[PDB]
Amino acid sequence: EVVGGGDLGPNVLVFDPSTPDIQGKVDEVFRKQESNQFGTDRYALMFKPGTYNDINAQIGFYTSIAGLGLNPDDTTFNGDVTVDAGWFDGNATQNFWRSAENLALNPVNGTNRWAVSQAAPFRRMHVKGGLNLAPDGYGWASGGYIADSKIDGEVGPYSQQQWYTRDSSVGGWGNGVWNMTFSGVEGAPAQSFPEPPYTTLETTPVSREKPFLYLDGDDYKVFVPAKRTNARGTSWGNGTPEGESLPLDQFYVVKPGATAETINAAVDQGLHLLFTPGVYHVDQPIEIDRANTVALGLGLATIIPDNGVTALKVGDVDGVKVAGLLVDAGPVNSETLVEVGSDGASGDHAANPTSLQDVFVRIGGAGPGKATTSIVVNSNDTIIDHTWVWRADHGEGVGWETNRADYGVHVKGDNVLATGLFVEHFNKYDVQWSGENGKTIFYQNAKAYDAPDQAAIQNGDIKGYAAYKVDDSVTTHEGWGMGSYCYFNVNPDIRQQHGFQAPVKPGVKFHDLLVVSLGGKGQYEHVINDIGDPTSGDTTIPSQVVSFP
Numbered sequence: 369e370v371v372g373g374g375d376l377g378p379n380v381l382v383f384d385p386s387t388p389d390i391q392g393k394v395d396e397v398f399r400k401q402e403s404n405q406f407g408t409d410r411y412a413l414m415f416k417p418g419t420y421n422d423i424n425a426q427i428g429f430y431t432s433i434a435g436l437g438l439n440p441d442d443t444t445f446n447g448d449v450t451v452d453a454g455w456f457d458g459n460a461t462q463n464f465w466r467s468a469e470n471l472a473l474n475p476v477n478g479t480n481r482w483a484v485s486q487a488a489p490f491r492r493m494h495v496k497g498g499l500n501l502a503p504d505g506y507g508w509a510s511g512g513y514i515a516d517s518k519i520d521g522e523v524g525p526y527s528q529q530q531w532y533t534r535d536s537s538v539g540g541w542g543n544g545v546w547n548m549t550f551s552g553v554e555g556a557p558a559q560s561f562p563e564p565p566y567t568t569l570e571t572t573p574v575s576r577e578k579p580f581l582y583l584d585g586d587d588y589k590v591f592v593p594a595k596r597t598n599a600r601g602t603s604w605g606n607g608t609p610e611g612e613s614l615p616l617d618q619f620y621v622v623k624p625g626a627t628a629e630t631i632n633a634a635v636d637q638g639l640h641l642l643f644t645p646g647v648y649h650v651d652q653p654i655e656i657d658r659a660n661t662v663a664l665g666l667g668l669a670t671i672i673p674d675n676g677v678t679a680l681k682v683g684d685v686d687g688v689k690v691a692g693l694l695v696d697a698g699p700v701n702s703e704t705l706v707e708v709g710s711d712g713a714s715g716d717h718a719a720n721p722t723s724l725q726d727v728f729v730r731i732g733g734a735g736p737g738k739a740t741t742s743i744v745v746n747s748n749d750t751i752i753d754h755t756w757v758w759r760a761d762h763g764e765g766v767g768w769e770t771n772r773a774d775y776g777v778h779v780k781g782d783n784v785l786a787t788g789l790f791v792e793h794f795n796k797y798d799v800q801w802s803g804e805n806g807k808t809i810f811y812q813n814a815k816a817y818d819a820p821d822q823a824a825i826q827n828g829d830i831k832g833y834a835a836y837k838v839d840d841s842v843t844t845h846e847g848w849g850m851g852s853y854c855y856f857n858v859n860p861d862i863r864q865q866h867g868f869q870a871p872v873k874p875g876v877k878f879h880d881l882l883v884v885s886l887g888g889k890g891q892y893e894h895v896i897n898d899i900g901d902p903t904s905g906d907t908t909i910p911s912q913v914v915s916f917p
């Protein structure tokens with residue numbers, strides 16, 4: 369059999385307004401995690417409700433930080449939750465795999481710094497001041513994601529290339545660079561793309577905030593927010609939100625040596641899943657096939673599928689909420705790494721969809737890794753709300769053929785919604801969409817940097833594979849605020865025909881598309897299909913299309 373809750377383990381650090389020496393304890397964790405890009409250390413830093421002084425929590429790799437009130441101001445720092453780029457000389461483009469949630473910050477000089485790139489979510493926060501998203505010195509950065517937050521002051525992206533903000537409120541917005549996209553953001557500036565580069569939607573068509581651990585006195589529980597349709601502003605701002613409150617004791621609590629058979633036992637049983645911060649090798653797919661199951665990872669908990677298996681398969685059921693996991697490919701090629709629904713998923717899940725939130729996939733970088741497709745999205749009405757699906761461009765075990773990964777995300781279900789979609793470096797199509805009435809709000813892609821010649825990436829009569837392809841027999845699709853970048857470093861004479869590919873049809877629509885060549889390392893011929901300017905020069909200027917077709 370099994371057994372509910374238990375021990376969060378030595379990787380979940382639980383503070384309150386004693387705990388002696390706080391700076392020192394978060395100081396240590398940062399020293400060991402700051403440069404630790406591909407290590408297997410994992411940590412979640414959890415703060416009980418209360419007020420905390422003379423704090424500055426610098427957050428390194430694979431560190432999550434959060435509060436345990438039901439609401440963010442229940443846990444207040446007079447002080448900072450800080451990400452900077454010291455370890456990389458003010459270059460913030462490797463500042464990955466960390467997170468902040470459910471805290472109020474009163475930043476020591478008036479502005480908190482969160483200078484991150486991909487897979488660094490900022491959720492359910494209240495900043496009582498400004499928010500600077502740039503490293504000190506204002507060097508390179510490539511984030512980013514804010515949801516369900518209230519920034520009393522101005523957000524300053526400065527050097528940030530791109531950004532997505534959802535269902536939030538901001539006291540100001542400083543600038544854009546290439547693609548700043550907003551949905552359901554109060555204080556968002558009006559649609560203006562290309563100058564400034566702002567894509568702005570009054571509302572988010574559907575959203576459902578990511579589940580989180582909190583304290584009910586001396587009782588741990590997981591708050592699980594309900595669906596909001598046409599979401600705008602925060603879910604918490606005018607007080608206690610809609611949801612359901614599940615005790616720790618109704619979760620199976622995964623520590624790094626459970627098997628996929630026991631994780632499974634536990635699900636078949638009716639227990640939810642809470643992954644404690646660690647790395648979990650499995651020899652079978654984790655299989656979630658009960659409705660309303662919650663599978664929540666702390667401290668960037670990571671699943672590695674061995675033996676070429678799929679890591680995670682969700683059945684054809686309502687309401688599964690997968691949140692806060694990194695899926696890291698093994699050296700043996702996996703056919704798929706994550707599947708949501710079966711091969712031909714026909715029913716609906718309108719009222720109670722399945723979602724992936726802060727689900728990150730890595731192929732290579734910490735050793736060789738391979739997978740044919742990373743995420744397959746079969747079930748109708750699925751919500752993909754912040755994902756980074758990343759074929760490693762640096763680190764260990766990468767190479768055009770060494771960490772080969774042809775396909776990033778393939779969407780086959782209908783009425784699927786992606787908000788905050790980041791997918792990079794696949795050998796073939798990064799994103800393919802075959803289902804009907806899909807919607808993407810915000811896309812960031814960089815193409816494979818390692819392609820060795822033009823022939824390698826030939827797509828029939830087309831040079832390259834689109835970063836985002838909508839199948840030709842698709843009738844209805846819409847995308848907002850989307851960019852694809854190239855940096856063909858191995859062979860800069862390569863040409864990429866386009867960033868985007870779609871049939872021409874009145875029901876297929878795109879808004880605010882762009883492609884960019886980074887320092888002239890290769891060029892795009894067009895933006896989408898054979899439409900839009902090629903990129904030219906070595907000067908980093910996007911080519912843009914505002915409206916299509």
Ligand SMILES: OC[C@H]1O[C@@H](O[C@@H]2[C@@H](O)[C@H](O[C@@H]3[C@@H](O)[C@H](O[C@@H]4[C@@H](O)[C@H](O[C@@H]5[C@@H](O)[C@H](O[C@@H]6[C@@H](O)[C@H](O)O[C@H](CO)[C@H]6O)O[C@H](CO)[C@H]5O)O[C@H](CO)[C@H]4O)O[C@H](CO)[C@H]3O)O[C@H](CO)[C@H]2O)[C@H](O)[C@@H](O)[C@@H]1O
Nearest residue numbers: 461506507508509510526527529545761792814855886908
């Ligand atoms: O590393 C692997 C990792 O790589 C990623 O891809 C890399 C990619 O991110 C990188 O792209 C470079 C790109 O970011 C860079 O963008 C610049 C942008 O930084 C610049 O910002 C300016 C600010 O500099 C400026 O600062 C102001 C300052 O001048 C003044 O002193 O003070 C002001 C305050 O008072 C301050 O504001 O502010 C302005 C706005 O006011 C910003 O615009 O802006 C320019 C364009 O305007 C923009 O181009 O450009 C580089 C080239 O020029 C790019 O190279 O490129 C790498 C390649 O070398 C990529 O590898 C991937 O995504 C990850 O998957 C990989 O793992």
Ligand SMILES: OC[C@H]1O[C@@H](O[C@@H]2[C@@H](O)[C@H](O[C@@H]3[C@@H](O)[C@H](O[C@@H]4[C@@H](O)[C@H](O[C@@H]5[C@@H](O)[C@H](O)O[C@H](CO)[C@H]5O)O[C@H](CO)[C@H]4O)O[C@H](CO)[C@H]3O)O[C@H](CO)[C@H]2O)[C@H](O)[C@@H](O)[C@@H]1O
Nearest residue numbers: 424448450452453454455457458476477479480481504505
């Ligand atoms: O006390 C509250 C504040 O705490 C901060 O956290 C500290 C943290 O930011 C700091 O990180 C250091 C990095 O900033 C540093 O990175 C270098 C840059 O500083 C530098 O920028 C300069 C720029 O300052 C100057 O004005 O102009 C120069 C050029 O025109 C520009 O270069 O650029 C460097 C690269 O060229 C870059 O390396 O590197 C240090 C060493 O690794 C980091 O230490 O570290 C502190 C250590 O404890 C943190 O406390 C918050 O960020 C603030 O928001 C808080 O208010």
